[PDB]
Design a binder for these strands. Structure first.
Ligand SMILES: [Mg+2]
Length: 410
RNA sequence: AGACA
RNA sequence: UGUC
């Protein structure tokens, strides 16, 4: 066992060219207050609806005003009004109607307070909203035993993003890392049932385009996986047409058919064709990686964040979070296009990249033990699946630009 | 469904 | 079962 630590001087870029170090929520929020987030969403109506059945509850109220002052002071979204809508019974139809009222009054976003756990209701409403407008759900029974300050700080991180905002991105070296990173693969709905996903990222960690395949039979996996990728690269190029792609990386993950060696060839085929369709430089350097969780990592005898453990020249363990125990990410170099002189240098770039992408979750102020390239699609699968199992409204990427371009799944 | 181990 |  041989190991190397990721170079540990790196920063987020927020508003007005300011930088803040990572892993320090204090200086991030202070930075946001002064400089604003990297990109302030443009809202049409300057209006958010708050939809709940709580009376004149003094809780909706401290909430309301905390949302209100933070959205303005932390996020720099000005002149925002929150209108409230109240529903009789916590049943679907009753809440939906308050959704529709809100909508035809002209709202940029809906915050929806549910009373308790209730999975069929939640996924039915979320499904409706995702096709309609950016949404942030809430539970009153969680909102009651949590410190408001923590709950709102975090809640807004992802609500701002769903509104098209960009809280913060990575400060990247233009030279090092991939031009784009494609998170790809599939997750199991049922046992005969598959959906494929393909999501394109910039090395600063921002999602550019998101494509999802039809819920399809497991047999036809290798078909829609190849299909879906092409579609992401198509939709990304039409949107970024003068952007030469010389370094491509694939991040393959999710619970999918166990047909690996054949999965590999087809991703190679998918690339060669993208070359010949002049969507990617004719001499693209690329790598195809499997990222997987594994067993917790124990250093014995009496493990720093960003530690890269070489299990073999194709397999690495990468630690994403400080042990203060730790589940690392398993990263396999399944296939590549690299000369051998480069190779070692390219591996570590690609492992550094993964480590940085793990600091890029927009669900809140604490980032997941995953790179966004694996986490985001996992949250997709999350929603697509329950929308299947609970009879919600189908989610359709082709049919409008905002779903292919916004992190609706946070 | 505020999230994170 | 914990953390803010
Ligand atoms: Mg969420």
């Amino acid at each position: 066992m041989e190991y190397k630590i990721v170079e540990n001087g790196l920063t987020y870029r927020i508003g007005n060219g300011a930088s803040v170090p990572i892993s320090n929520t204090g200086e991030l929020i202070k930075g946001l207050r002064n400089y604003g987030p990297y990109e302030v969403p443009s809202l049409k109506y300057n209006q958010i609806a708050l939809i709940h059945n709580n009376q004149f509850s003094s809780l909706i109220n401290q909430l309301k005003s905390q949302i209100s002052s933070k959205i303005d002071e932390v996020w720099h979204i000005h002149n925002i009004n929150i209108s409230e809508f109240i529903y009789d019974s916590p049943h679907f139809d009753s809440i939906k109607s308050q959704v529709d009222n809100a909508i035809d009054t002209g709202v940029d976003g809906i915050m929806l307070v549910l009373p308790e756990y209730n999975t069929p209701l939640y996924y039915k409403l979320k499904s409706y909203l995702i096709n309609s407008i950016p949404s942030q759900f809430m539970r009153y029974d969680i909102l009651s035993n949590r410190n408001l300050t923590f709950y709102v700080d975090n809640l807004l991180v992802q609500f701002v993003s769903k509104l098209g905002g960009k809280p913060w991105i990575l400060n990247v070296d233009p030279e090092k890392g991939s031009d784009i990173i494609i998170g790809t693969g599939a997750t199991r709905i049922d046992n005969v049932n598959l959906f494929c996903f393909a999501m394109v990222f910039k090395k600063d960690g921002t999602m550019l385009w998101n494509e999802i395949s039809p819920i399809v039979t497991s047999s036809e996996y290798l078909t829609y996986l190849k299909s879906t990728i092409k579609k992401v690269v198509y939709g990304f190029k039409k949107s970024n047409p003068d952007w030469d792609v010389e370094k491509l990386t694939l991040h393959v993950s999710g619970k999918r058919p166990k047909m690996k060696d054949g999965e590999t060839k087809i991703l190679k085929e998918t690339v060669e064709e993208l070359k010949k369709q002049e969507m990617v430089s004719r001499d693209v350097k690329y790598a195809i990686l499997h990222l997987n969780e594994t067993h917790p990592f124990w250093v014995m005898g009496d493990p720093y964040e960003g530690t890269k453990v070489k299990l073999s020249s194709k397999r690495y363990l990468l630690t994403l979070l400080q042990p203060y125990p730790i589940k690392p990410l398993s990263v396999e170099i399944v296939s590549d296009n690299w000369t051998s002189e480069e190779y070692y240098h390219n591996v570590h770039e690609i492992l550094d990249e993964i480590y940085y992408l793990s600091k890029m979750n927009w669900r809140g102020f604490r980032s997941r033990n995953l790179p966004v390239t694996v986490n985001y699609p996992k949250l997709v699968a999350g929603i697509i699946a329950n929308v299947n199992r609970y009879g919600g409204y189908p989610i359709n990427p082709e049919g409008n630009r905002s779903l292919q371009t916004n992190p609706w799944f946070l």
